[PDB]
Each structure stands twice: as C-alpha cells, then as structure tokens.
Amino acid sequence: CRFPLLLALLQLALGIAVTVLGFLMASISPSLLVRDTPFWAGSIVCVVAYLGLFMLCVSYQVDERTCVQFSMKVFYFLLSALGLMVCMLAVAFAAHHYSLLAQFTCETSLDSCQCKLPSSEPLSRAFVYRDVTDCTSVTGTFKLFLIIQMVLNLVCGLVCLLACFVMWKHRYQVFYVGV
Amino acid sequence: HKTGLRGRKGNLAICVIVLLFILAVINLLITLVIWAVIRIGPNGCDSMEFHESGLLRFKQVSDMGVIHPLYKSTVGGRRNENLVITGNNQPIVFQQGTTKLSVEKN
Amino acid sequence: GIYGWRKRCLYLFVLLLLAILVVNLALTIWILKVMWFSPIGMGHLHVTADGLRLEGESEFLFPLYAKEIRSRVDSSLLLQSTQNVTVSARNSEGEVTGRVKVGAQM
Amino acid sequence: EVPDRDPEKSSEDDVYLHTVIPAVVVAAILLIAGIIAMICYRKKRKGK
C-alpha cells in the first residue's frame, strides 16, 4: 500500500546514505577493520529496498491476491528482519569502537598515529594508523563521522522494525466477527 | 469445528521441540567435555588459581619448556624460604657470550 | 488441548527458552575460542592428571616467584643472557649483601 | 640503530565482539518481538 511504499523509499534512501558513508570510511584511510565499516550492511539494506520497490510495483501492477504473493511476502518480512538485525549489530560495533576511542590521549608520529590508552603501568595497548596527515585532524572528525553514522543506522533499524511490524499487525491483530 | 493445534502445525511444533532438545543435549555434552578435560572442580581449575589481584598460583608439576623473560621479570624465590636450582643428572650451565659457569658432575 | 491463553503462554515460554539457549551456545563458543581447545589440552599446553606440559616457548612479563627450578632428564638446563647473569642473596633485612655475576669477560 | 621494547598488552577483544554480541542482539530482538506479539494479537474487534 501507500505506507509500505513510503517505508521502502525511506529504506532505500537510508541504505544509499549509509553505503556512501561506508565508502567514505574506506576511502579516508585503510586503518580500520572490515567490521568497523558497515557498508556491507548498507548493501544488504539496499538490496532489501530494491526487492521492496519491485514488490510494491508488482503489487500495484498485477497478480495482487494469489498464494505465491504471500509466499514471498514472507520472504520480504524475513529479509527485513535480517536487515534490522544487521543494522543493530553495526550500531553495537560502532558504539564499542567509539567508547574505546573516546577515552584516550593520542600523539603524532612521523608516519603514523602511534599512541596508547591511559595505563596504570607502562605497558598497554598501542594503536597506529596508516598515512596520518595529522593525529589532531583524523581524530577529531572520526568521532563526528561515527556519531552521524550511529544515528543513521539507528534510524534505519527503527524503520526496519516498523516495516516488519506493520504487515504482521495487518495479519494477526484483527479477527472477523460477523460470518 | 475445533481449536488449537490440529494439523501440520502440530507436526511442526513437535519437530521444533525435538530439534531444540537435540541442541540442548549437544551443548550439555560440549560443556561436560570441557569439564572433564580441564578437570574443573569445586575447588577451582585444579591446576591454577586465578586470584583477584591478577596473580596466578600454579599448584602442580609444571613443564614450561622454554622460558622467555621479557620485562620486569626476574626469577625469584618464594616468600622467605629459598631458591633451589637442581639438575637431574645434567649439568647446569650459565652463559654470557663466551663467558661460562658450568656445574657439571664432579 | 492447548486452546487459548495456554497456547499464548507456551509460545512465549518456548521463545524465551530458545533465546536463553542461543546465549548459552554463544558463551560456549566464546570459551572454545579464547582457549585454543584441543582434545589433549589448551592449545599446545597439554594437561594431564600429573600436571601441566608445554610445547614451544613461553613469554613471561613481571617477576616469577618459583619455588624450585628443575631441569629435564634428557637435557641440561642452560640459562643464558646477553649483558650479564646476576645471582643475588639477601640478609634478614632484605638487603643485597653477596652476589655473583657472570659478566662480559670475567 | 635497532631499538626494541615490548610494552604490548595483547587482549582477545576481536573474538568477544565477533561471538558474544551477535547472539546478544539476536536474543534481544527475539524478546522484544515476543513481548510485542503478546501485547498485540487480537486487541481489536473487527465488527461487521
């Protein structure tokens, strides 16, 4: 209907936004693991939204109320559920990495962002970064990028949850009384 | 008519219950294998004791093979008794470049 | 049976059990991955009733308060260094008084 | 010119993130889905 179409449009917009953000993450510097850039989750959301747009075109075109329609409506529902799960997982990963990165002091080196976490005793974890233009430039905008990306996947996951919830409420909330 | 689980749904429910039971049994077997192999008991790991203040206390004959001290690691004796180094029918050979100190037999 | 509210309680109970089982399986996998688990022991650290055993090196940070270092039956213990090898002793006041030192040349 | 110092504090954080977190989030999703379904599921009388 109209509401599923709006939800699919929001899904595609947010998927393209998060994929663009992940591509920018990768392009800034290859200092970050594949987990920390959730662009894979963005691509998954993008294919989800592509299937959604095809669904909401074919439903408005022809073959509206047959059995196979429901047979892959269930596929749409489960696919949106996995999209929501992957979005929440990306949120969790980004939150953990931001929490690690937000409570440490860093210094610049000749070619890398070598620095350590605050330590009670002189041995602790050390992090170095590829091709750092300045340790006060990448670190200082990375947190802003992370926060924006967090908001992006939070909204995407909420939209996915609502999309999953709407069709189920359509099916299992109203029971017919008269005949 | 009738209400409840009537047809194929009953079979699906029974299959799901059986599958969950199988998974639980597999998990229990894995945990029991862990307990048997590491000899975990009511008194602890039965070979180490992870103290709260980050201090391991081995309590059995330990064969560390090759030891590689790295930093702030000086081999020391226990609290106020001794430090006995013994060689079971083999010489004890210190070394520093070419300088030596070898306690052989005789 | 299982007509009404009984069904809507049984379904919730099964869902809760499934979630708990999934969490437990994750914890078990985490344990199996932190400890390099093998049928013989943790990684190369073979474990038996008599005691522990190793196969390879063993790095050590911070001091090592052993009781009595021994040596293998088939091999001679060979302490080594690059700068010096210092053996010390302490009086009742915990002060170094006598010490031997295998130095660079003497 | 050959300096070597070993203050590295290795810690197995990758395994924890790769293993515990996905199951925790899956369990949370299942719990919220079940609660929502129980609160819902025939709260509306479709008259006529």
Binding site: - | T3 | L12 | G34
Partner: peptide, 5 residues
Amino acid sequence: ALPKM
C-alpha cells in the same frame, strides 16, 4: 483458531 503469540 489462528495461532500466534
């Protein structure tokens, strides 16, 4: 008797 949680 449409079954669900």
